Ligand binder design. Structure first.
Ligand SMILES: [Mg+2]
Ligand SMILES: [Mg+2]
Ligand SMILES: [Mg+2]
Ligand SMILES: [Mg+2]
Ligand SMILES: [Zn+2]
Lengths: 136, 94, 131, 140, 141, 38
RNA sequence: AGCCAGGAUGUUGGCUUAGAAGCAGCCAUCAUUUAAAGAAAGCGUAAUAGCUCACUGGUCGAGUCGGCCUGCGCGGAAGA
């Protein structure tokens, strides 16, 4: 599971998830999995999609993860009242906004990349589409 | 040698640009050269079917606006975040 | 892949050899053998040459467009599989003889070895002079 | 040498050694022979040959595919194609740990109208996890 | 009557006549027995493939006899005997795929121009050349 | 048959039909590819 | 779309050569032979047989074939 090696603070405010994404372009690889929807993706989901792509496409090829969790989400224990401090951290989530490219891939044919990204998207909570580089 | 048809915009702003993009046109600009910038509106579907080609971005384009052609080249393009739609195209003259 | 211009060019290219040589041929698609017909057609090509038009483009309108420049009687549609055995070496060459013999063997039917000839009226083969 | 089972095709060659030329006790040399054999096996790391016999089956010429498919689902090989006037004779090579109750299966797949005989042909290598199981059941 | 009528590819290439015991018992469809095993191949299986690859068509006939025009000298035999190393596919690109040589091709062209010819004797010669080169590697020639 | 909430053509012989509004997959190749609801 | 036909004879592949079969695994190998040979589809794929991945020639006279975006609909949808 992806997670920051070190973090300045253990806990983080919930915050909102407004706006569109800044990683809108296919930068590293040739193909990419853009986000059409909005939401959170935990490290478990990101890693599950990574298993999916890596096993679907051949071992050959290069895969980039454009998204990192870097957000500590907390849960209160079960059967516990409200208050008495903030809940302890349980998992890490990458906030996604429409247009964020999540993964990129290179060294692969068009159709095989499409199949791998379809299998990956089957593992993710948000709507995702398939994109390719463009000149400039 | 790609040729595009453009009309000079009347109103400029957030609302006007949104109205254009709802009306299937979209804003664009031609700056550079020895004269002032020109804000135009472009037919979105034609521009997409034309710019799908990679040569649209290295070839010299001719934008016919109010009867006169301008020889220009696409500098930058604002793409919609999660849809195949262009939001704005910059053209440097020549 | 018989496009408009591609088919026009192919019809002309097929008519060229036929008009340069003796009568062409025909091989309907009814019954062939795995090796009896394969080796027979191989030997037919070897005797005839490497330029026989084994392909078929004998549509009525296609022939009326390309072949019908001269001897329009051949423009009639040969509604069956067509394989043409070019015969440069004389009139009714060894390829023609092979098609005539295979009309009743080694193939479904040779369409009576109809072919096309400039006279277009001598039903008899190239044996005008008895001698 | 391995799991209490015998060996074939080994050939021994005492090339060198040492002794005293007064009393070369055969019983005392047997300990040296045993240790030499043990070290030799340890350095050889040789493997086991299962008992594979030749089975010759006569079956009608309608269940040939079924019977040879059964013999192939079994980890067995085939040898020779023949067509009798009143049937077909298949020959195969099969282990002994396997083909336990092969007659009932043959009868099931041939309507009880096929016979087989066995003659214990020369062995062959076979990957079986039981060969080490039988010896490792007793530790080391 | 019918040529072969059962094309079961479980017959030894050249070598001993009727090598079924090595060929495998998974080809019981053919009616090959002691009568048709060496009816003609015994006396006509030495001048075509002597230690060289040559698949043989049985050509069994339903007319209560076995008779037909047997295959000419094989290309797999000629190009293998005139190359030295009969290697080929399976290890085609990673190692030697046997020598494909103009000498073997010309020998095939000159010798096998009797029966096994396609669109020409030279055409079957080019066939043997392709069968030699397509194995994965060819020598300088 | 299969009443899965997502029915697909599992081979070339499958056909999509819309009997009674329901979307079914009918196979003339082998019966395991029969599905019920879109 | 529907109705008339073709896929070898160098090729149990030169082959993981005791073949794994003109369509097991296999490397990759138009193999000129062409209305075609892929050394691969349900068949038997361990094997032919007769239908036959594919693809074409003929048959018949006007739309045809699919992808992308979008509006409204369908299933997914079970409680006292
Ligand atoms: Mg506003
Ligand atoms: Mg719905
Ligand atoms: Mg409902
Ligand atoms: Mg219910
Ligand atoms: Zn199905």
């Amino acid at each position: 599971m992806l997670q920051p090696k070190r973090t300045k603070f253990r806990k983080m405010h919930k915050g909102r998830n407004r706006g569109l994404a800044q990683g809108t372009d296919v930068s590293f690889g040739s193909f990419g999995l853009k986000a059409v929807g909005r939401g959170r993706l935990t490290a478990r989901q990101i890693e599950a999609a990574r298993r999916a792509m890596t096993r679907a496409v051949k071992r050959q090829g290069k895969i980039w993860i454009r998204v990192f969790p870097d957000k500590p989400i907390t849960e209160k224990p079960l059967a516990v009242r409200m208050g008495k401090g903030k809940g302890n951290v349980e998992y890490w989530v990458a906030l996604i906004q429409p247009g964020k490219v999540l993964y990129e891939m290179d060294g692969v044919p068009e159709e095989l990349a499409r199949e791998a990204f379809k299998l990956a998207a089957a593992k993710l909570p948000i709507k995702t589409t398939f994109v390719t580089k463009t000149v400039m | 040698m790609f040729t595009i048809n453009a009309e000079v915009r009347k109103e400029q702003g957030k609302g006007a640009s949104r109205r254009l993009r709802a009306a299937n046109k979209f804003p664009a600009i031609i700056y550079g050269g020895k004269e002032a910038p020109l804000a135009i509106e472009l037919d979105h579907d034609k521009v997409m079917n034309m710019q799908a080609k990679a040569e649209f971005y290295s070839e010299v384009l001719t934008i016919v606006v109010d009867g006169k052609e301008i020889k220009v080249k696409a500098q930058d393009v604002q793409r919609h975040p999660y849809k195949p739609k262009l939001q704005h195209i910059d053209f440097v003259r020549a | 892949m018989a496009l408009n211009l591609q088919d026009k060019q192919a019809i002309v290219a097929e008519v060229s050899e036929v008009a340069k040589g003796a009568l062409s041929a025909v091989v309907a698609d009814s019954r062939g053998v795995t090796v009896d017909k394969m080796t027979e057609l191989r030997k037919a090509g070897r005797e005839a040459g490497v330029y026989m038009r084994v392909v078929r483009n004998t549509l009525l309108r296609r022939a009326v467009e390309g072949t019908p420049f001269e001897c329009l009687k051949d423009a009639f549609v040969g509604p069956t599989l067509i394989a043409y055995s070019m015969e440069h070496p004389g009139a009714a060459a060894r390829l023609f003889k092979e098609f005539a013999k295979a009309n009743a063997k080694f193939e479904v039917k040779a369409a009576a070895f109809e072919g096309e000839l400039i006279p277009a009226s001598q039903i008899d083969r190239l044996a005008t002079l008895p001698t | 040498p391995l799991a209490g089972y015998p060996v074939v095709d080994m050939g021994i060659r005492l090339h060198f050694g040492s002794y005293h030329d007064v009393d070369s006790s055969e019983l005392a040399f047997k300990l040296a022979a045993s240790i030499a054999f043990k070290e030799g096996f340890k350095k050889a790391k040789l493997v086991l040959l299962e008992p594979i016999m030749k089975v010759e089956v006569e079956t009608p010429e309608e269940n040939t595919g079924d019977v040879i498919g059964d013999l192939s689902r079994r980890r067995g090989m085939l040898k020779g194609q023949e067509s009798e006037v009143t049937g077909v004779k298949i020959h195969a090579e099969v282990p002994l740990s396997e083909m336990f109750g092969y007659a009932t299966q043959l009868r099931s797949l041939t309507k009880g109208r096929a016979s087989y005989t066995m003659e214990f042909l020369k062995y062959d290598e076979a990957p079986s996890n039981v060969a080490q199981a039988v010896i490792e059941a007793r530790g080391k | 009557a019918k040529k072969v009528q059962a094309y079961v590819k479980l017959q030894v290439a050249a070598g001993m006549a009727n090598p079924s015991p090595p060929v495998g018992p998974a080809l019981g469809q053919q009616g090959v027995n002691i009568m048709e095993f060496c009816k003609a191949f015994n006396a006509k299986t030495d001048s075509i493939e002597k230690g060289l690859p040559i698949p043989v068509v049985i050509t069994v006939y339903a007319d209560r006899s076995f008779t037909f025009v047997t295959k000419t000298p094989p290309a797999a035999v000629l190009l293998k005997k005139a190359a030295g190393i009969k290697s080929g596919s399976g290890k085609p690109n990673k190692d030697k795929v046997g020598k494909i040589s103009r000498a073997q091709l010309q020998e095939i062209a000159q010798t096998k121009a009797a029966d096994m010819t396609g669109a020409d004797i030279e055409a079957m010669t080019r066939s043997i050349e392709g069968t030699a080169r397509s194995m994965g590697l060819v020598v300088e020639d | 048959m299969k009443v899965r909430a997502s029915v697909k053509k599992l081979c070339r012989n499958c056909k999509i039909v819309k009997r009674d509004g329901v979307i079914r997959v009918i196979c003339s190749a082998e019966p395991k590819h029969k599905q019920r609801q879109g």
